[PDB]
Design a protein around this ligand. Structure first.
Ligand SMILES: Nc1nc2c(ncn2[C@@H]2O[C@H](COP(=O)(O)OP(=O)(O)O)[C@@H](O)[C@H]2O)c(=O)[nH]1
Ligand SMILES: [Mg+2]
Ligand SMILES: [Mg+2]
Ligand SMILES: [Zn+2]
Length: 420
């Protein structure tokens, strides 16, 4: 109930009663890493660009923590577009309406967020250092829009013999109000485990300057602990020297004919419908978030497949149990670029295979989205999903790229095979 308010709060920001990308009647789909709102139609294109550019959650359908809402509560659509849709003319501008076709929709959104065409332009190492300490979120966004790359560092002020990088700074000079940028940076220039000059991670710095809520945000983004620096200190070690006890409490816990009825699960935007329909149509179709579920029958090599694709949003996952009875094979789709939510996919997969109504299930796991930059390869999936120590259950991790089709029919071929 704490969140109910913050939800309402996010919705009431300037411009957040129109879709960020097509201005449609009050949107419910949040790009958590950009703090903006889109209609369900535009929403899907974001899911297509992947978690590298945009992490989508529904305000109505996903279970949202306060921490996830930070940028949403600190940006909104008007603030954002002022930067990102800056150089857009009012007349004839390619920005679509509530019901433009997916053709025109896709093109604009891809140009806007990936290619950055319609953004206020200018380089710049100077401003970024100034904006951060000014706590000027909207200018950090301006920097991002011109391809700044928070990765490599910036030359500092007086006596500039050493070198510091973006995130390392923002953590040093932060307060309650300064937070949004810290997150915007983590989620958008994620060189989170960099060591800089004297081997200190960004995690290290937070333990030096009494920046507690900074630590919170850092670990939330899966940060490595106990990596040693030039003084060979774990992040806890420096917390000890200056005795900042609040940081120390968080660091301690941080340590620890044949027919087959198929059920296709996995977290939101895993690729589930993309898979189902590429198999049924052979051509890759565009997918909107599947709010309910989908059923199609695909025949491949004289075997009929009754596939039940179910939507993966936090709120529509308790509904999964219902589809357990009469199920032979399970397809669990995993979005492999989504490194932040693998343990979530681990949990839900385990939450199924352990259900009493399931013991006799063949498990195919699609390790989807292998085409995306930092992939996470299939063997690394086995280990992260805790399949190392699964015996007395028949599984198989299959590399896949739904968009193209690679690895899909193979998964079926494995299904055909292990159904004897
Ligand atoms: N690059 C890439 N994108 C994919 C792949 N599979 C799915 N997608 C995209 O991911 C977004 C989510 O697809 P979707 O089927 O709706 O996921 P689902 O809701 O869990 O079923 C879609 O826009 C797809 O275009 C893939 O293998 N590679
Ligand atoms: Mg969640
Ligand atoms: Mg779906
Ligand atoms: Zn829209």
């Amino acid at each position: 109930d704490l969140t109910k308010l913050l939800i309402a709060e996010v919705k009431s920001r300037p411009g957040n009663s129109q879709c960020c990308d097509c201005g449609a009647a009050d949107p419910t789909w949040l790009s958590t890493n950009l703090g903006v709102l889109t209609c369900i139609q535009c929403s899907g294109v974001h899911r297509e660009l992947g978690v590298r550019f945009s992490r989508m959650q529904s305000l109505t359908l996903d279970l949202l923590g306060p921490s996830e809402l930070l940028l949403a509560l600190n940006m909104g659509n008007t603030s954002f577009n002022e930067v990102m849709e800056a150089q857009l003319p009012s007349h004839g501008g390619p920005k679509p309406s509530a019901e433009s076709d997916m053709g025109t929709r896709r093109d604009y959104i891809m140009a806007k967020y990936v290619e950055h065409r319609f953004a206020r332009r200018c380089t710049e190492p100077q401003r970024l250092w100034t904006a951060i300490c000014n706590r000027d979120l909207l200018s950090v966004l301006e920097a991002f829009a011109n391809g700044q790359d928070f990765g490599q560092p910036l030359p500092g002020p007086d006596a500039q013999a050493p070198e510091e990088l973006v995130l390392h700074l923002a953590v040093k000079v932060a307060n309650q109000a300064s937070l949004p940028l810290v997150d915007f940076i983590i989620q958008n220039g994620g060189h989170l485990d960099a060591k800089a000059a004297d081997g200190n991670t960004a995690l290290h710095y937070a333990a030096l300057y009494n920046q507690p809520d900074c630590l919170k945000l850092l670990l939330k983004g899966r940060a490595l602990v106990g990596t040693v620096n030039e003084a060979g200190e774990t992040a806890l070690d420096i917390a000890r020297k200056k005795h900042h006890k609040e940081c120390e409490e968080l660091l301690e816990q941080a340590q620890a004919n044949k027919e087959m009825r198929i059920l296709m699960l996995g977290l939101d935007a895993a690729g589930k419908t993309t898979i189902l329909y590429k198999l049924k149509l052979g051509q890759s179709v565009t997918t909107i978030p599947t709010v309910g579920f989908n059923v199609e029958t695909v025949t491949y090599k004289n075997v009929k497949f009754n596939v039940w694709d179910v939507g993966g949003q936090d709120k529509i996952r308790p509904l999964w149990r219902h589809y357990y009875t009469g199920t032979q094979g399970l397809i669990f789709v995993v979005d492999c670029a989504d490194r932040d939510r693998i343990d979530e996919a681990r949990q839900e997969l385990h939450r199924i295979i352990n259900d009493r109504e399931m013991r006799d299930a063949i498990i195919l796991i699609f390790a989807n989205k292998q085409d995306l930059p930092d992939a996470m390869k299939p063997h690394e999936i086995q280990e992260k999903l805790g399949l190392t120590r699964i015996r007395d259950r028949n599984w198989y991790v299959q590399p896949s790229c739904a968009t193209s089709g690679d690895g899909l029919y193979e998964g079926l071929t494995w299904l055909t095979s292990n159904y004897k």
